[PDB]
């Protein structure tokens, strides 16, 4: 039973890392389509020149 | 990873539609309207660099290579570099560029 | 002599102006290149990590 709990904890942590990294990568993706107003560029290379 | 995401989210929030750049009608001297911090910092960074370049220019033109001026140039150059770096740490790239547009 | 000296000075200044013009044109191209390098780094090196 202890190993089953620990196994759930380990699966949660692995998923947290996957979610965390996906979130982190969302900050680097250039919104191709002009339209979406919402994603304000965070990187000077994003451009705005 | 969470710590890094939090940092980038803070930068995104700061970027959101911020920095009212009042068209300084040049004639209207008086209204103490307070320059946005980003504009002041960018301008100052740019002015500092201009004065530095100007100094190089004046020297190039006046042929007086006073021996010891190089230590002072390096310092000035470093000072600007630090300031420029500070500007990029303190403000969002979006606001800096906006400030440059206005300038 | 002053007029001549002054003419030299004007010529020096004129040279600097020509240098700055070139300098600013180059800087503009560089800014475009530098922008393309940062975008290329994000696309080639960072964006592929989430899949791994």
UniProtKB/Swiss-Prot annotation, chain A:
It comes from Xenopus laevis. Belongs to the HAUS3 family. The chain holds residues 151 to 199 of 597 of the full protein. The lineage of its organism: Eukaryota, Metazoa, Chordata, Craniata, Vertebrata. Contributes to mitotic spindle assembly, maintenance of centrosome integrity and completion of cytokinesis as part of the HAUS augmin-like complex. This is HAUS augmin-like complex subunit 3. Component of the HAUS augmin-like complex. The complex interacts with the gamma-tubulin ring complex and this interaction is required for spindle assembly. It is found in: Cytoplasm, Cytoskeleton, Microtubule organizing center, Centrosome; Cytoplasm, Cytoskeleton, Spindle. It comes from the Eukaryota.
């Amino acid at each position: 039973h202890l190993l089953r709990v620990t196994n759930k904890k380990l699966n949660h942590e692995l998923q947290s890392i996957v979610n965390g990294v996906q979130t982190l990568m969302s900050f680097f993706s250039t919104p191709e389509t002009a339209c979406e107003l919402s994603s304000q560029p965070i990187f000077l290379s994003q451009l705005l020149l | 990873i969470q710590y890094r995401c939090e940092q980038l989210q803070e930068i995104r929030r700061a970027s959101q539609r911020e920095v009212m750049f009042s068209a300084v009608d040049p004639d209207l001297s008086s209204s103490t309207f307070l320059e946005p911090e980003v504009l002041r910092d960018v301008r100052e960074v740019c002015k500092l660099r201009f004065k530095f370049l100007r100094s190089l220019h004046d020297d190039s033109i006046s042929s007086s290579v006073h021996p010891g001026k190089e230590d002072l140039r390096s310092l000035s150059h470093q000072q600007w570099m630090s300031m420029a770096e500070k500007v990029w740490n303190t403000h969002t790239p979006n606001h800096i560029l906006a400030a440059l547009e206005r300038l | 002599q002053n007029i001549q000296e002054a003419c030299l000075l004007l010529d020096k200044k004129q040279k600097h102006i020509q240098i700055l013009i070139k300098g600013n044109s180059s800087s503009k191209s560089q800014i475009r290149r530098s922008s393309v390098e940062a975008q290329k780094y994000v696309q080639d090196k960072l964006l592929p990590w989430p899949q791994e």
